[PDB]
Every structure is written in structure tokens, then in C-alpha cells.
Amino acid sequence: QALQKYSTDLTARAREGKLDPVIGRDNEIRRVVQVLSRRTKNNPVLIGEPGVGKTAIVEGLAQRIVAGDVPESLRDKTIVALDLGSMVRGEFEERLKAVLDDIKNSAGQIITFIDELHTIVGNMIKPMLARGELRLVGATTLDEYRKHIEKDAALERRFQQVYVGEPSVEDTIGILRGLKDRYEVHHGVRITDSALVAAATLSDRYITARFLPDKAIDLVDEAASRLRMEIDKEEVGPDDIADVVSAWTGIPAGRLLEGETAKLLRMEDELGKRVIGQKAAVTAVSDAVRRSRAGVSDPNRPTGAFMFLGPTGVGKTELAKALADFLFDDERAMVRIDMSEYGEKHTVARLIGAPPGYVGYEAGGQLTEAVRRRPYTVVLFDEIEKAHPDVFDVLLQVLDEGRLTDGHGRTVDFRNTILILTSNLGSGGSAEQVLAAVRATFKPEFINRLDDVLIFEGLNPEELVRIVDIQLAQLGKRLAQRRLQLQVSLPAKRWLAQRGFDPVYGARPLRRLVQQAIGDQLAKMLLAGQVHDGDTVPVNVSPDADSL
Amino acid sequence: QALQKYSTDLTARAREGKLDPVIGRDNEIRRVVQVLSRRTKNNPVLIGEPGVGKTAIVEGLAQRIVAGDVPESLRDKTIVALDLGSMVAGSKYRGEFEERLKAVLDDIKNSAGQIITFIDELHTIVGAGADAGNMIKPMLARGELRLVGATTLDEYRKHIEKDAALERRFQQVYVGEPSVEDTIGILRGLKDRYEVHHGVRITDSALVAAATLSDRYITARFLPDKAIDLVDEAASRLRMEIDSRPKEEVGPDDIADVVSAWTGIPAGRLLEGETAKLLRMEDELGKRVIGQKAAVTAVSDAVRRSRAGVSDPNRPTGAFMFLGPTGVGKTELAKALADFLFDDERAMVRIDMSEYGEKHTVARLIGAPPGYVGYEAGGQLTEAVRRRPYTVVLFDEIEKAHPDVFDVLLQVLDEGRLTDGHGRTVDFRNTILILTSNLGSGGSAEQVLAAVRATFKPEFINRLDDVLIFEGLNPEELVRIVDIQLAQLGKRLAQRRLQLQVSLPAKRWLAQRGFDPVYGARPLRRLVQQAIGDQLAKMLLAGQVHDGDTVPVNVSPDADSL
Amino acid sequence: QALQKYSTDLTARAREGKLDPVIGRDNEIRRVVQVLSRRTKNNPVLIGEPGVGKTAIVEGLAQRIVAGDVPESLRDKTIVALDLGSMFEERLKAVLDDIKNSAGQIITFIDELHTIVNMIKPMLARGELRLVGATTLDEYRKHIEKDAALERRFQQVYVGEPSVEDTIGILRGLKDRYEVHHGVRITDSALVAAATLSDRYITARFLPDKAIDLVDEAASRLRMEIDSRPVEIDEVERLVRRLEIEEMALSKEEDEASAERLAKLRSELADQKEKLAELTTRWQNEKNAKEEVGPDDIADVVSAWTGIPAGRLLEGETAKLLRMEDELGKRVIGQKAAVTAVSDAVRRSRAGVSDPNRPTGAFMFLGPTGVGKTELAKALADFLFDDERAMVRIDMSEYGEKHTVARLIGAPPGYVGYEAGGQLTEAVRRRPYTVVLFDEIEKAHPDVFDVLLQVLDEGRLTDGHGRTVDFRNTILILTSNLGSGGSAEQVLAAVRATFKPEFINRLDDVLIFEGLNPEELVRIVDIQLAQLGKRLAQRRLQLQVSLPAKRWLAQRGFDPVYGARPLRRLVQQAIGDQLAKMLLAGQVHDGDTVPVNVSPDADSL
Ligand SMILES: Nc1ncnc2c1ncn2[C@@H]1O[C@H](COP(=O)(O)OP(=O)(O)OP(O)(O)=S)[C@@H](O)[C@H]1O
Ligand SMILES: Nc1ncnc2c1ncn2[C@@H]1O[C@H](COP(=O)(O)OP(=O)(O)OP(O)(O)=S)[C@@H](O)[C@H]1O
Ligand SMILES: Nc1ncnc2c1ncn2[C@@H]1O[C@H](COP(=O)(O)OP(=O)(O)OP(O)(O)=S)[C@@H](O)[C@H]1O
Ligand SMILES: Nc1ncnc2c1ncn2[C@@H]1O[C@H](COP(=O)(O)OP(=O)(O)OP(O)(O)=S)[C@@H](O)[C@H]1O
Ligand SMILES: Nc1ncnc2c1ncn2[C@@H]1O[C@H](COP(=O)(O)OP(=O)(O)O)[C@@H](O)[C@H]1O
Ligand SMILES: Nc1ncnc2c1ncn2[C@@H]1O[C@H](COP(=O)(O)OP(=O)(O)O)[C@@H](O)[C@H]1O
């Protein structure tokens, strides 16, 4: 009572009701009060993620004390918190010893409470502990406890671990609707259970950084305040919260709705916006992804295991680069592993990395280490027909059971990824001998487990226009830093085709071909003159090359 | 006035009786006294692993001094419990801790030789530096302060032995843990304090059960406190159960309740109902395994033997190897067992021995020796059994692993031991090892029993229990296999309200299709999928099938129809 | 009422009407009042960097407060500050008691509380003062990011700098105040040029005050040059005056070796004297027919800042860059494909076309040894900085260990090597314009690649202290010799299987040098002999080599497995050996020229 400047009270202000009723989490209080009444290894410590309700539990304990529900062994005691940030090189221990003296002079069982004790731990308080005068209650997280309370601890023999995992959705919903009338008078508009459950599920779904009991309340109170500030609609609602979540993340409030039909029905041209032609292919792949996400197939299998073959450079990779954007929300999600190194017997274990203590161990495997983190990729396999006939064992093990075991000992799961097996077979075969070749080259019962084996059709010599038009409308962005406009002339743009297609490399050069030509040919004018940001820069076909 | 703000008075604390009654440990106290009464270098240090009672010896000497049961030249010495945390606490300056330590030393030596000191966990005396914890040596090797100490073996080795010139001034008294009998004696001494703290009663049968179970199942801690803790927990637990809820003493089954609540192990004395479950086991397990009557009996008898109290308490709870034809149901029996006695079909630890064709890949389940790349990670198998020490270990198809991995199981079995890279040990004493294979595959019991003897060696075949030979799928009962599959399918189709109406001809044909005697029931799940689930996935996304439809199937001449 | 002395006021200054120009940031003000009208985690803190305009944000907040645009809980709220120009712990009770007795109507604004955080924390846990904060992000993360004891009452509010179209309005709202001291005119041309030019180029400070300091320094520079003789009329005059005194002290030199230094210092004087006259004559033209700020002094102050060149078209730099591919062919021979590529990416930066958030160029060339993959980078660094010493060259062969990543990043605080700073970061933090050479990238530990993966497409990286140095105006070069025997597929596969494809992704064109041939070797023999002459011109012993001699040389050392180094070895062994045999045996003393000629096998001097 003489040095009460680096610590607060919990039972005094509980005579005022300055604390929230603590509905939920009625088991942890029994656990704590049971550990607090032993003879040794008493004075527990709460262990859990930040923002889950550890302080909430200790406050509820204080409130049950002031009410009177505990055994008389614990009856008639106060609780005091400790702020570690109020002290901090040195003199931290001076104030700490001045505090411990007061605690000992308390001459009773006046229980303390220390939040984030792993800032203290040490050998200064253990004699205070192993004598029977203080009782501390703590708080930290699991990995912290494993660090500051496990390596140099030697005190783990007097701290009891109590776990506070995290609430469920249907439980934090009750928590919220219990903590509702408060804000209904603080701001005061109106509250709908629809808004509450919407906040809960949307935070759970898209806010993957924080945790539930406060993560939800954050959005609820911020949205209520935004609605109050609006009055410079007299109700709150689910859209009234999706707008907040969108202003929080960046993704628009439209897509923040149904994710099954509103996705399967988008498998239309929204793919064909980035991919071109091959409409049979896109429709087939869309069937594959739709009927697989229905919810009747075996739950332990990839979400798609189709392959496609034919000519090069027509967009074989581009279909996957676009598909990763629509489903997993990124084009930096695919992983491509060439089956050209894997032409020997031994190198098949390079994509796992076998033993602890050999050359490639901490480097992990090529196929697994890129999956156990971010398990939502889109795996490609260039020129699979060249891989040694031993990789197929690992591959069949994948697509027959959604699991695999790396070198470390971890278990990885492939039950929500998409396999893709490209190939350059089909040199002359149109549709007749190409399938005979791919039925005789690969194992016959392997292809029994695949999905559709669709064959890309060549670029229609007219349907080079759409791809080059996408390329050109893209490069229309290039010189927007100067706002210079571009000229198009269908003879010139078609003159790129017959001299840049090169159907041995698909359509690969048509990016450098045009960017180097236009950019570094204008690089004289763009420095001297001849152009400004209203000039379409008329470029045309000289009888030989592409002058202006 | 220096050793009053940096120390307590342990002998005065013993006078007020605030200490627990040290019981036994007479050789150690006699050695400590005969070391503490020397002429020069009278400094004993109690060394021993954590929890074995190293401070209790010093409190015992304190109580003995108070009672006057010490030799001639040791009466009224008033030992003192020094501490350094309250000295190195406030000082950020040059020469500030040294004046404190020098005042303390001067006050100890200005009094006559009657201030026996006591620094506990003295491995925290090597620091204090920034030439500190080092002023103490000239007074140490001259018999001026006694300095009874107590540290752990590991901490001693790590901190003190790097300073050999100070280890010379210490005599190591080795404190070894007591056996179960001395632990029972200690508990008999200490029962009263707990009986008074918690307003309950404690029974000697419960004490014996604590000291015994605390030694067969908790194989990481040490005895005199590992045993006391069970008593304390059960007493507090019973007190809570008596209160707060509007024959009242701890019994020899509450301790089993605790030691089974944590560690998971079902150690106990067969509470009622569990016995009914165990008796009704051969059939309750048959609901997921059709046939193989000769094999389920062995496993069931093994489990019953283990829990009835008649089984060698230091050897695995079963080491069967069952082998036979292909797709007969071996792995499936294993999974059915694991689901039976754990309620989680993945609560087992299966390793796929088809991957160890190369010699070196053994290190995955051992770990790597000191000084190599993956060292502090440990071994897969060792770490997977060190926690959850009650699982069912499974070795799928141990016939590809070339004959150098066998020689690790050769001592896994028959003792339940295994050592990782760090030199620890795991206890397999209460798992069930199961290892399948495929040798033979169709032949008589003497055309497979010879291939076994030509593949494995006597030292290994001689380790395990019965070598079960699985039968063939009787062409009459496959309707029940199909029924099991359809039960699984219907359970999967319950997020909606769908049901199935499979006709007898449909079921009969489904069994008749895809059960070739060369592959057994292997190509059946895939067939059911491709012939029902695909057809219905095309039929659910395109309307005309909505939740509630008891979808009927039919047996059209060609492949099945809906 | 006892804080009227220890703190200023903004409830009365706003009624009187004096406040700095606040335009924009109205959404920020709305965010601040919105977070103030909450129950928990209210009372925000502003996060940014010095000179973004959060001071202006709170000032506009105060003006809007006195005007009235508020909710009900904001009855003018009499927001005040707590003057950090008022600084002991016995007075702070007297300061805090006034706010404590109030009902939350005198809320404070702790400008730069980053150092304030005992006394304010318990008085915050009861919830009586708002204590509006404003700091920077790194100091925030250091001080009050890890302490969750106080992070339950602080909601960080991010702010950005650029408001270009209103930055010009701010310049206007300040243009009046900068024309008073400097007797100059600050034109809208200058406003809009500085608002538009120093933004991407001078990327060390931030627009809302760097666009201010540019105009301030331009004003001061112009006011200085208004004095009779301006810049570049005060420069060649100070040069020619000094040059003369260097000539009048060399005539009285009884030396023959300094005559050639007297015979040149005279000439450069004769060359600089004219350009003095030409400017002086043209001066009177403008004297009878600069007195105002424009767009040229802007680029002037840009160039004089951070060494970065950023002008309209700098009238001495025009024909150099179109001559680059040819100007570079004086030092590097062959690899037309490589010189075209390395060249087409310097203009696209001096033109303003290239991507503004990526290095001004970053790509790799590799191939056999002794081809020029290092002489090319050296030649590049020689004609941009005019001295080859001005290239940052780090070797990746010493970084073969994992824990050597902290060698070029620095070691964390509290360790031994801490004040020494980094090795790569500490060179690009101060004066970033150089070219950084990564010698033998293959020999490095495949973990430093994860740092260049950051530098690519982000343009910065962090060090041991936590700050971020910028990498947006340099060129990054990679050298290696993977394969070294394969045509094009072995080396392609080797680099593809040695580096991540998402590291080769952000790279520009990947270059493969060919190797030298007989036709390109005579041009190298000439460079070698010219450099050798320039070297032994310190004893005035010029050489005289014949065409059969140069052909004998260029034929002798050619073998297409080691490149060109055998040529230097042969030059030394065949000429310098004999020459140094004679030079200390007399008979070839200073001031001499010895001819060489082909003999049947050797070439006698
Ligand atoms: N059962 C509950 N009853 C009432 N409020 C609860 C409950 N569980 C969580 N909360 C609230 O959730 C928020 C989380 O606050 P805290 O309990 O302090 O978080 P924490 O888990 O203790 O970790 P810290 O201390 O925030 S780092 C507070 O507003 C609590 O009041
Ligand atoms: N011989 C004994 N007689 C009575 N009680 C004992 C005896 N041995 C151990 N105990 C009790 O068992 C526990 C042993 O704890 P301590 O010996 O005090 O700790 P420790 O043995 O020093 O281990 P550390 O390393 O200090 S944590 C205490 O509760 C003792 O009272
Ligand atoms: N008696 C049985 N009761 C139920 N399902 C069975 C039975 N026998 C086989 N099966 C089914 O057969 C399928 C595969 O059987 P498995 O036991 O996995 O084959 P196996 O015993 O592992 O033999 P191999 O050599 O490993 S293929 C599973 O779907 C089981 O459900
Ligand atoms: N095309 C060239 N232009 C200019 N100097 C050249 C050329 N080819 C060779 N040289 C000279 O020959 C030597 C080769 O220098 P480097 O460029 O370091 O060799 P390199 O091509 O880098 O081979 P490595 O892999 O670095 S050993 C230097 O003395 C160069 O001056
Ligand atoms: N249908 C298409 N839609 C869009 N771009 C396409 C299409 N077909 C080919 N392309 C373009 O052709 C080029 C080749 O892409 P890709 O197939 O990934 O090449 P590679 O086979 O060399 O890896 C890319 O620039 C890609 O955008
Ligand atoms: N939007 C604005 N436009 C023009 N001048 C401004 C604007 N906001 C503030 N100012 C003035 O210019 C100064 C720029 O520095 P300031 O914004 O105070 O930085 P800080 O407070 O972060 O140190 C302000 O102090 C103010 O006098």
C-alpha cells in the first residue's frame, strides 16, 4: 500500500464493476482455482496466443472472488497486476526488489499477476518463490514459453501450464452478443445478429493475422463508429461490415459473398480474359474443377490431375498462370519443375531429400518443400515424357492418396492442389497417332487415374489477332509515364505474324520482337522530338522493316 | 548488519518447525557432517539429478543441529541461506558489488567459526563478473566458510568444470535417487502434512499405488517428487469435487485416474463397462474386418492380457507379423484396431517400408550423430513415440527394405528400447508393433513359412509373437464388404440429405466385378467411385437430383445404371 | 488553467485565424475523428516520415474543429498540445492535474512522443486523456511495437506524402513568404517543375518538404548570382587566374622534364581564356536587350544534389549517349550483341522511359574466361564517373558461408562489430549512383541470393539497425563462368538449375559472351601497346613497333581456351624482359626511343 505505483488493483475496481462480465470460458477458472490450492507447484501461468482472453479469465476470477463462489481457502484475497513496461541499463532490479519487499511485508497470500513474464525470465526471485509468501499468475505464448521458460529456466518445477486455445465462431458469437448493449449506448444505432455473424465469419475467413475475441470486436466497433460519423441508413448490417473488411484488405466488397456458385459460374471467359482460344480446353478444365468441388469424391486426392499436350508456346503454361489467379488469388502460386534433370535412377530422390545428415537435407525436396508451405499451389511438369520411369511411383503415390513424407519426417498433404503435366508430344499426330503414342509411352494404368487428357489445338492463323491484340493493349500501358499514345495499323500488326510466329517456339519471341523494335527504335525520337502525349506516333511498314 | 539484508536464517527457520520431516538419507548426512568438520577445504556439494532430494538433506542437517544430534564440534552453528540475486541486483557502476561481497565475507569471518553458510544452486556463482565470484577462493581453500552447496549434474559440468581452480575447493557428495521402498517410506512420513492441508484422508494402499505407478509409466522424471506430485494432485482434485457440488478419501484408483489423465496411458484397475467392451471385442472389431477369424483372436487376446495384469511389464504389448496374399485386409485390420482402442484412425504411427530400399535411409528413424547436419531435430520414430507413448506402430510391407533395416527392430522388439542421436532412450513397452508383408502370396502354409525363414534370420523370427497367415477372401461373404463400402459412402453423403437404394442385383454385380483372385478386394473402392460417385456428380450439378432424393440404382446389362 | 504558460493553444489561434495552409488530408482527419469516436483502441498515432504533413494534419483538424463539423461528443474539444519546448518530475504533476480534473475537453497532442515512452501509462489505463501521437514507423517499431501493455490504446494512422496537384498549392501558400527575403520571382513554371521533377530523381527525402527546399535553395542561388558576376562567369575567371599563376612559376624552372608540363599548362590556359571571352561578350547582349526563377535552376539544384543527373537535355551530354556504343568500343572489343544491350538501357533511364521502381539496370553476362566480362563493367564505370576507382566491387567468393550474410548487412545491435556498419549497404546509403559488381556470383552461398531477390523489383533492403537504403538508381552486374565449354544449352541449363527461376525472372536480358577471334586480336594488341607506352612514359622512353611485329604478336598468342591474358603474358615476357635487361645495363637512358623488329623467332629490340 506504500509503493502502489508500479501495479494496479483488480478486486477494488471490481467493487465498482469497471470490468466486463466474462461469460464463456468457465472451465479455465476452475482449472486455475484448483491449481492455486495445492501445496507445491501451485501459482499457475496462462499460455496462449495474444488476444484470446487470458486477462479476461483473471478478471472473471477476481469477479467470482468479490461475489463469493470459491472455497474459503481462496476467499478473502486481493489480486494485483504488474506492468513490466513501467520499469524499463539497470535499476529494473532495484525497483523489482523494492516491490518484492512490499509483497513480502503483505504477510499473507495477496496474489499478484504478471503479464508477459518472459521479460523477467530470474535467479533473483526463486528464493522468494520457494518459501511460501507470494502467488503469481502469468501470461505468455507457447513459443515464448519454450524460449524464456525452457532453456535457461530451471524454475519450470514451480509453474503450472494452463491452456487457453481460442474460441470457436459460434462461441465468439455469443461473446459478441453479450458485449453488445455497451456499444448500443456508447455509439448507439442498432445491432443485428446478421451483422454480428457476418463480422465473425468474415474476420475468420479473410483476417488471418489476429485472433477471434478481439479481432471480431475490432471490426464491430470500427464499423459502428464509421456509421456514427456518416451522419455529418439507421441500422448496421452484413454489407455494412463487408465494406469495412474491403477497406481493410483491398479486395472489393462484391466478391466477399458466396464462394461456391459465385465462383463456379465465373469459370467462364474470366479465364479466357488471360487465356485465348482453346475453348474446349477451358470448358473441360472448368468441368473438372466444378464437379470435383461438389463434395462427393474421396476427400484424400488432388483437386485436379489433368494433363495437356500438343504444340509449344500456344499458351500451355498461360492457362495455369491464369487459373492460379482465379482460384488461389495469385499468379505467383504455380511451381514448375522440369522433368529433364530427372532422367537418371538416383536423381528421383532429389525432390524429397532423404536422410538427416547427408548432402541435401536442409535444402529440402524440390516437390515437397515448395508445398508444405503454401499448400495451395499449381504444380507443373515440363516434358514429363522425358522423366525417368521411377518418378511415376512418387506421382501415383501422390494422386492416389493425398499425403507424402519428406526427408525431415514431416507429413505434407496434396488434397487441395492441382497437378498439371505438359508435354511436347504430338509433332505430326493431329488426333490419331498422338493418343496411341501417349498410350504406349506412359504406363497404361497411370492414365486410368488422370482426368481429361485434352489436346491443345494449333493457333488458327487468323486467331493470332487476339493474342497480339492483348499484347498490344498491354504494351499500351508502357509509355503512359509520358502519356504518349500509340498507332495501330492492321497490316503492320499482321506483319508481325508471318515473321514472328515461328511454330517451333510457339509465340515466345513476339514480346522481345516488338518491345525492342518499337522502344529502342523510338529511343532516338523519345529523346530528340517527333512525339508528345497527344501523338499516336504513326508507325507503319517500310517495304523492308518497321520504320515510323 | 551485512549478512542480514543478503541472507536468511535457516536454523532459526527450523526452530519454528516450518520444515518438512526429512526421513532417511542417513549415509548422506553423515558424510556431509564428516566433510564439514575437516581442517581445511571443508566444502561439500550435493550433486544429483533434479528432484531427488538435494535440498532436503540440508534441511535435515538443520533440524538435526537444532535437536542437538551433531558431533562435538558442530553444536550451535546457525547455518545461513545466502543469496546472490539480492546482491547483484542494484549495481551499474565500478566496484559496487565488491563492497557488498566484502562486507559479507568480513561479517562471516569476524564472528568465530560458527556461521556455516549455504548457497543453493551455486552454479550461478561463476558469473557476477561484468574478477567476481572469485574473491571467495582464498577464504575457500582455508576452512573459513563452509559453503554447503547443491547443483545439478549437468549444470555442474557445464559451469564449474570450466574453472578447474575452483572445483578443487569442493568435495562432491553424490546423491542418488531412492528406490520404490524408500519412496514409500518417505510418503508414509509425509502423509500427515497433506492430510492436514487438504481436509481429506489418505490410504496406505493409495500411497503404495502412487509410488509404484509413478515408476512404471512416468519415465522422464525422478522418484521422491514424481511420486509426491500424484498424491498432491489427487488430494486437490478430490477437494474440488467435494466442494462446489451441493468414501470421502483418496483411494488406490484416484492415483490411476491421474496418471491416466496425463500421459494418456490407460493404467488402472479395469473400471466397469470397460470390461464389457473388452469382452465384446472379437465381434465389435469384426464390424470392420470380414473374415480372418484366426487373426483377430490373437490381437484381442493380447490386449486383454495386457490390461488384465498378466504380461511381462518390460517388453512390448505385442509384436505380431501377419502376412499372406494380396489385398486380403491386413493393413485394414491394423487400421481397424487403431480406430478401436483410440477413436482416431490416424492415431497410429505408420511408416512405409517400401521407401527404405537403400541402406542409408535408416537415419530417418534414428537421427544423426553429433556434429552432422540434421542433429538437433532428433529421429522421426523416436520423437513420434516419445510423445503419445501409447500408439500402434505399423510397418507396411517390410520386404523391400534391404536386409540392414531389420537389425534395428531386432532390439526394438524384445525390450522396447531405441536410442536417438542425443543418447536418449524411448520406451516401447506399451505399444503394439505390427509389421505386414507379402511373402508367399497364395502358397500353402509351408510354401510361405519357408520363404520367411530364407528372408529373415533366427535372431529376428525368434523375437516376435505368432506369425499369422491370412486366409483368402471367401467368395460368399463379399456382399458384406460391399455393404461396408456403401456405409462409408452414405456417411460421406450426409452433409446433404441423400440416401441410396442399392438393389440386390446391383450389389451382387458390384461384388462380382473387381475382386480377381490375384488382387483380392483391392480394385473395389476405385470401382465404386468411378461407377457411382462420378455418375452422381454429373447428375447433381446439372439438376434433376436435389437433396432428399433416395437415389435408386439399377443393374442394366452393361455397366451399372441409375 | 495552469497550462496556459507551459503549452501553446490552438483553440484560440484558430479563432484568431492564423494557421499553416492545410489542403487535402480530409479523409485522414475523418479517420482520426472516427477512431476518436470509439470505445477501445481510440486516440490514434500518426505514422510516417519527417516532412509528410502530419503537423499540418493536426493543424487542419484544429481549424475544422473551431469551424464545426463534428459529432455530439466533440463540443469544440479544445484540443491543446503539451509543449516539449517546456523542459523536473515535480512539475509534471502540476501539468497533468489540470487535464486530470477535466472531463476530457482539453485533450493533448504529444508531438514526437516516441521518446516519452510510469506517469502517463497509469493515467492512460483509466482513460482520461487522448494523447494524440505522431512519430515515424521505424522508431514506432523500436519503441512501442513490442510493448503490448500500451498497444491496446494506440491505433496507428498511416499517411502518405504525395499530393502533387496540391503540393503546388502549398508552394503557392508559401510562395509569398519566400519572395520577401530573396528579391526574386518564384514562377509557376518553377512550382510545377519542382513538383514534378525532384520526385522520382531525388529519392532520399520526401516531396512535401523536399519540393520546398528545392525552391528555397534555387531562390538563394539566384539571389547570390544577381550580384554582378553570376555562376559560370565566376568560375572560368577563378580558373584562368589560378592557371596563370601556375604558369608564371614554371618559366623559372631549370628543368627539361617540366618543359612538357609547361608546354601544356600554357595551352589549356590559352583554351580557357577564350571561353571566358565568349561568355563575357555574350553577357552584354543580355545586359542591354537572369532575374527570375525558372525550370533550369531547378535541374541545376537537382544535379548538385546526390550527384544524380536529372535535367531537360543538358546540352553537353547530348552527343555522348548517342555515341555510347561507339565510345565504349575504344576499350572493349567484340560482343556487339552485349554492347547493344548494355547501351540500350542507359538511354532508357536518361530518357525517362524505364520502370521507376527497379534498378536502372540489372542483368548478368557469363561465358568463357579472358573474354572481357570484367573489362566491360570497368569500361562502363570509367565513362560515367571519369575514374575507374568509383565502382563498388564485392567478391562473392568470400561469401561461401551462411553466417557471412551479416558481413554486407552489419551485425545486430549489442554485438561486437556494430558501429562498423555494413559493407554493401554502407556504400550505397551515402552517394547512391554507382555500379555494383558481383564478382563470381556462383561461388556464393545460395542464401545471399535471397537478398538480391529482395533488391529486385522492390528497390531496397534492411540492415542491422533496421533502416532501408534505396537501390533504384544504380546498375547491378553479375559475372560468372558456368559451363565454360558448352555451346548454349549446357550453360543455359546450368544457370537455370543453379539459380531460382524467380530470381532469373526479375533479371533483364541474360548475356552469353562468345570468345575472341584473330580479327579482333590486332585491335587488342594495339590497346596493350598503347597502355604500355603510356606506362613507360614516366621515364620518357617511347617505343616504336613495326607492323610485322604487331602481326607476329597477334598471331603468337591466340589459343581459344584462355582468352586474352596470354597476350599480356607474352607482351611482358617478350618485350619488358629484354627492355629491363638493358635499362639497368645502361645504354637505354632517359629521353630515348628504341625500335623493335621481327627476327626469325624472337623480335630483337
Ligand atoms: N469470455 C469473455 N468474456 C468477456 N470478454 C471477453 C471474453 N474473452 C475475451 N474477451 C474480450 O476480448 C478482448 C481480448 O482482451 P485480452 O483478454 O486482454 O486479450 P488477451 O488474450 O488477454 O491477450 P492480450 O492481453 O490482449 S496481449 C477483451 O476486450 C476482452 O474483454
Ligand atoms: N528424504 C526425504 N525426506 C522427506 N522429504 C523428501 C525427501 N526427499 C525428497 N523429499 C521431498 O521431495 C521434494 C524434493 O524437492 P527438493 O529436494 O526440495 O528439490 P531438489 O531435490 O533440490 O531438486 P531441485 O534441483 O532443487 S528442483 C520436496 O517436496 C521434499 O520435501
Ligand atoms: N475382411 C475385410 N473387411 C473389410 N474390408 C476388407 C477386407 N479385406 C479387404 N478389404 C478391403 O480391401 C481394400 C484393400 O485392402 P488392404 O488391407 O489395404 O490390402 P493389403 O492387406 O494392404 O494387401 P497389400 O499387399 O498391401 S495390396 C480396402 O478397401 C479394404 O476395405
Ligand atoms: N574485348 C576486350 N576488351 C578489352 N579488354 C579485353 C577484352 N578481352 C580481353 N581483354 C583483356 O584481357 C583481360 C581479361 O580481363 P577480364 O575481363 O577480367 O577476363 P574475364 O573475361 O573476366 O575472364 P574471367 O572469368 O573474369 S578470369 C584484361 O586484361 C582485359 O583488359
Ligand atoms: N491463348 C493465349 N492467351 C494469352 N497469351 C498466350 C496464349 N497462347 C500463347 N500466349 C503467349 O505466348 C507466350 C508463351 O507462353 P508459354 O506457353 O508460357 O511459353 P513457354 O512454353 O515458352 O513456357 C506468352 O507470352 C503467352 O502470353
Ligand atoms: N498540406 C500542406 N501544404 C502546404 N504546407 C503545409 C501543408 N501541411 C503543412 N504545411 C506546412 O509546412 C510544414 C511542413 O512540415 P510539417 O508538416 O510541420 O512536418 P512535421 O510536423 O511532420 O515535422 C508544416 O509545419 C506547415 O507549416
Curated annotation (Swiss-Prot), chain C:
Keyword Repeat: yes
Keyword Cytoplasm: yes
GO biological process: cellular response to heat; protein refolding
Main location per the UniProt record: cytoplasm
Transmembrane parts of this sequence: none
Region (NBD1): 1-161
Comment block on domains: The Clp repeat (R) domain probably functions as a substrate-discriminating domain, recruiting aggregated proteins to the ClpB hexamer and/or stabilizing bound proteins. The NBD2 domain is responsible for oligomerization, whereas the NBD1 domain stabilizes the hexamer probably in an ATP-dependent manner. The movement of the coiled-coil domain is essential for ClpB ability to rescue proteins from an aggregated state, probably by pulling apart large aggregated proteins, which are bound between the coiled-coils motifs of adjacent ClpB subunits in the functional hexamer.
Role this protein plays: Part of a stress-induced multi-chaperone system, it is involved in the recovery of the cell from heat-induced damage, in cooperation with DnaK, DnaJ and GrpE. Acts before DnaK, in the processing of protein aggregates. Protein binding stimulates the ATPase activity; ATP hydrolysis unfolds the denatured protein aggregates, which probably helps expose new hydrophobic binding sites on the surface of ClpB-bound aggregates, contributing to the solubilization and refolding of denatured protein aggregates by DnaK.
Subunit structure: Homohexamer. The oligomerization is ATP-dependent.
Protein family: Belongs to the ClpA/ClpB family.
Protein name listed in UniProt: Chaperone protein ClpB
Portion held of the full protein: 159 to 845 of 848
